[PDB]
Amino acid sequence: GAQVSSQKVGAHENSNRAYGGSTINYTTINYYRDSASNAASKQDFSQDPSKFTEPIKDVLIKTAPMLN
Amino acid sequence: GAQVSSQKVGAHENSNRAYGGSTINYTTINYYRDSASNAASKQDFSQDPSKFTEPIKDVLIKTAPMLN
């Protein structure tokens, strides 16, 4: 039950495909029944730093005056 | 997510196919998530030696006289 995904190649010469065109993939196969044994899939996300940077009981427009 | 490609066999006897006809392939499988870990795919290209041999602010016709 193959888990084929795309690597993030830096368009390197003769790596399979780059500035001549083409993509690069890699096969994965979870082998153990217990999930906490799978390889850290590294396909992690990224949230907006707002819940820490911009946390206010209102909204802040940058071009506006801070302390209204 | 198999990467099957054709080898460049020298039509050797009983190698799978040659002067009796036939082709020869080989399976590849990128196993690591990090591209810089893939096997050097050796399917590299070849540019024209012109940017070094024939580099001029004009064009050079061989049958013509060099210093026009």
Add this chain to the structure above:
Amino acid sequence: ACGYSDRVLQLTLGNSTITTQEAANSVVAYGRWPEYLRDSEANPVDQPTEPDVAACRFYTLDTVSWTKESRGWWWKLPDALRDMGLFGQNMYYHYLGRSGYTVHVQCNASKFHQGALGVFAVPEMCLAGDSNTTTMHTSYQNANPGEKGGTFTGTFTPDNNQTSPARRFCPVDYLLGNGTLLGNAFVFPHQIINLRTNNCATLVLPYVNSLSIDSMVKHNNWGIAILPLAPLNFASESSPEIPITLTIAPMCCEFNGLRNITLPRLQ
């Protein structure tokens, strides 16, 4: 349109009402605002009691005087309140108590004074003791100062008495009491009351903890820690003094498993 300028607010949780006029548009801990326990992530199986208005309202603790030699103060919320009306009585009556907060640190001067008070709301604020021999040995009676709260110090002083020790925290200020630089402390939900501008800071803190609902008598959650960033100065006068005073309000709180009354050795 009108004067609905960020500078004026009117908090009303429960039957109390704060109405400040230099108000620096309030902070909501982590975007996440206080709420009740969704059945989807609940834990204890009985019916959770909810004082609602009975507790949710604003309770003023006691005021702290603020001089030049003032080195900062620190409260332990879950505990800080323990007396304050019913949120005090319900506090003890149950084995489990999940409570959110709304801390409004009140403190105003004239246009002629100067200074900045960094009001930092640190989740799981484990302050460090004072015995170079044994670690964490800090006594409860002493570890939970309540309505009065504790106070940061200038430089560390090791507790030597060992026939029997003084078992207290010796929280140094530049290390935010928990051995970690103050200058970097601006990472927790916070507001700097900067005397020139705003004359109060309002942080709404939603219950944060590794558990759905946990204890109160035992385990603490948020802890406020107010430190003078810019020291207070007024006129070529020996020493000036303004009085900082916080008022906290427990919001969306609920408590489980009623029993007999808890009566901790706070003395």
Add this chain to the structure above:
Amino acid sequence: ACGYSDRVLQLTLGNSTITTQEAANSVVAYGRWPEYLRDSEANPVDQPTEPDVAACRFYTLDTVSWTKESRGWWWKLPDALRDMGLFGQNMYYHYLGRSGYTVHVQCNASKFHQGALGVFAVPEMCLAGDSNTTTMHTSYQNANPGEKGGTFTGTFTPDNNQTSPARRFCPVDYLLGNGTLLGNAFVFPHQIINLRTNNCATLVLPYVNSLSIDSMVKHNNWGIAILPLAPLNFASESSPEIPITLTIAPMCCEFNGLRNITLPRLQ
């Protein structure tokens, strides 16, 4: 809507940025704003070079101290800058240089001081010398004070030395240096910095001159002249002192006919 009230601005010409907070909504010379030379009215035939960001940015000249006996100051723009980064180096390298400006005269006090500085931007400001014998004999070296600028005086003093003279301008203040009443001077593009209110004046001056593009090393264009209208007073104190400081920014400038470097006898 919001606090986009006239009192706050944020000039950004080039890689520099001014952000004043008492800002009296700026003046644009004559409605006409600074721009490049339209082919329709161009004159010299080569390719005009344009430093763009390299020059266009804000250059702070040097600050002037402002006391009670202070009688005013005066700069000669085209020249005033002559050093200030590349607008200095490009300045000299070409026979022709058309440049627009944005003068931001910075100067703030407390609510307790008082006074008004009339910042007048006079086009073709020909100030008068000081030799009752010969007229206009004023020396170059002396006529172009640059980054430092000159200063208006109380009452005229004739230069008597004649074996060899002092060849300087003797610019009287009530006559705006060019023998014409100050009270009537409010005709040129100007702003009065009136300490109670605004703490700066911003005038954007578009290149004005009888020619499409002219010289720089030679001919001057605009000239700033700041005069204390309302004298400075503070508390029954001998004498108070606030420091006025201008920052100019050459805008839409272009220069023609590159050569060898000009090196004027400025000493």
Add this chain to the structure above:
Amino acid sequence: NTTTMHTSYQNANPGEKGGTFTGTFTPDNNQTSPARRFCPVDYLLGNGTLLGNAFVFPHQIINLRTNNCATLVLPYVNSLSIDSMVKHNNWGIAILPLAPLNFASESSPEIPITLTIAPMCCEFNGLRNITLPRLQ
């Protein structure tokens, strides 16, 4: 022959005047304080690599019989998008007499070689205060 690369800046960047290749290598012995200069030998193109093989870089041979000038247009080449100037150098011209000059049974003849360079499509970032290197 003692320390490598110790060549001084003041000396390493000759500017408008430029430097000049030499006949045979001469080791700098002064060591109370050294002469810190380059000693670029010609058959090794100064960078320890044969001249006869040097015809690999963009080049033109001005061969007195024919052409009386050489014109090479060099596009900025460097491991970086845009780099420094005061510091890091890019291209470097190196003119070497391949066929030695001769004229008539005369003691010695002399012709004057003169280059003229033109910086093309240039751009510069981050303005500051003026740099004033110790070139003396």
Add this chain to the structure above:
Amino acid sequence: AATSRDALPNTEASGPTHSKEIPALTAVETGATNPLVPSDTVQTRHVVQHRSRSESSIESFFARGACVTIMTVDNPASTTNKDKLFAVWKITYKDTVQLRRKLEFFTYSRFDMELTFVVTANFTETNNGHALNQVYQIMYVPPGAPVPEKWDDYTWQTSSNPSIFYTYGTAPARISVPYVGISNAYSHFYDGFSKVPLKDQSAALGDSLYGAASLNDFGILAVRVVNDHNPTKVTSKIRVYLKPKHIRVWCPRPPRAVAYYGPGVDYKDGTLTPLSTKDLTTY
């Protein structure tokens, strides 16, 4: 959709200005930090930014496997007057400064501990002797289970105790462990006591240390030398490397500033001075 290996928002171009818009001016009281982009305080060009945060992601920060502890154990001659050494380490990262500071930036954490073992070994005594390739037992003794008395006792029968038998000189042993926490995140910082003191009891009967939660959270590791007393005494060391794999973190606490002291946040004197000198007016 915004993954860790994207590409930072490309820098947009921007010319002169004179607007009543005031990006540059903040006011830190609000606690909010002005999200000013380079494009605001200067004229910027249109850069097509390729760089991505793919490596700083919470997952990758903890991508390397740190050394949580070392464990000395040794097999002596039968005739040894002393009992045979079998080390027993209590699972808890808090033993070495490194992994302990990384984890400590965050208030709470949910990770899948993936423990690996690099076991080594030399002949103690000067004596010139031999030893047939030893095999080690690394028994995980779950919180509350009976911790091993003698080296060779019944406790090691391991009928229900996850154990590994590592043969010396071979690919270093590895066993993945899922979030074994009683709560919903391992609390890197516990404020409060494990037993409240109650007036109708003695000061002792109900006391306890600050910051301590569960008696045995993670567990304990029993490691013996499985072979019998051999004439040539061989001491060994089992360095355990813990690498948090499927991980998550909450509340960004400021990093440890002064040298660690004990299991609790407490700090010894002297070590109290962290910063370095520098003139308030020298680059």
Add this chain to the structure above:
Amino acid sequence: AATSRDALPNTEASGPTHSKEIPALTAVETGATNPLVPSDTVQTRHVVQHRSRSESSIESFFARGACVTIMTVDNPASTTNKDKLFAVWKITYKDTVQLRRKLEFFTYSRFDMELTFVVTANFTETNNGHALNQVYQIMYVPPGAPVPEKWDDYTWQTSSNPSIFYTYGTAPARISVPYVGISNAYSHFYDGFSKVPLKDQSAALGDSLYGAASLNDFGILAVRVVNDHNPTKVTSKIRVYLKPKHIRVWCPRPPRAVAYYGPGVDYKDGTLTPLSTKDLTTY
């Protein structure tokens, strides 16, 4: 489409001539080289050329893995009066002539360094002793990280330092590294200084060596003997072989003509004479 394993343009046939076409005559001033094919200066037949440049391709030239350095390390008896030897080599190909000349034909390069380790080991002293199969740690200490003080110090805890634990006698260790350059190609030749000298400073305060760029480009390798002081002192050698895999090259510079001297292009006297003798008129 024109790959490296094609087949050189087949030789076309060609008879007599008497044309005003002048292929044979060039004029090297133009710098351009006459692309004259055999078919021009002679009558050629129609050869169906099979040969292909598939092996000379930039990728295949660097297809073999060269030895960038050797590293001596040794585990002595506890009682050793001298500190235990742990070698530390600064990642930089420039240590041996071979790979250094190949790379040096080109001005710039972008490659993925694929480091392999063939570790060996013998008993130093005459003494007849034994040693249980040693295990080595090859810690990559990134540019700027703290380089290891003693053999067994905290630096080796390696909480965030890519390290490998090689057990002696086994398939030689291998770790691939992606282009770790700060720029967009490793500059095999850097012309210019790392600090410009400025008049308003002392000749010292602002000086620097020609050709040097970054203090620690590639990095440093710390390699210890992981086991403890064993009566029989065993010295080991870790030969690292670097093989540039996914590679690219720019600007074809003429190959090094005279023996290498130091990290910089500089050259010692004597070695200055490279060519051989031959009579200008003898085959």
Add this chain to the structure above:
Amino acid sequence: IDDSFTEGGYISVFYQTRIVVPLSTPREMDILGFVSACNDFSVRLLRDTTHIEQKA
């Protein structure tokens, strides 16, 4: 790391005027500086911070 080739630059606050105050005001006020990255910043190639040492 304090590398010369990859130098940072120089930051420096000066008085563009002077901090002017009225009578009966504290003549010596203090400024606090804060620093942070922008949605452009990013780091790479992880290592062990020099900042905290484990003595013995």
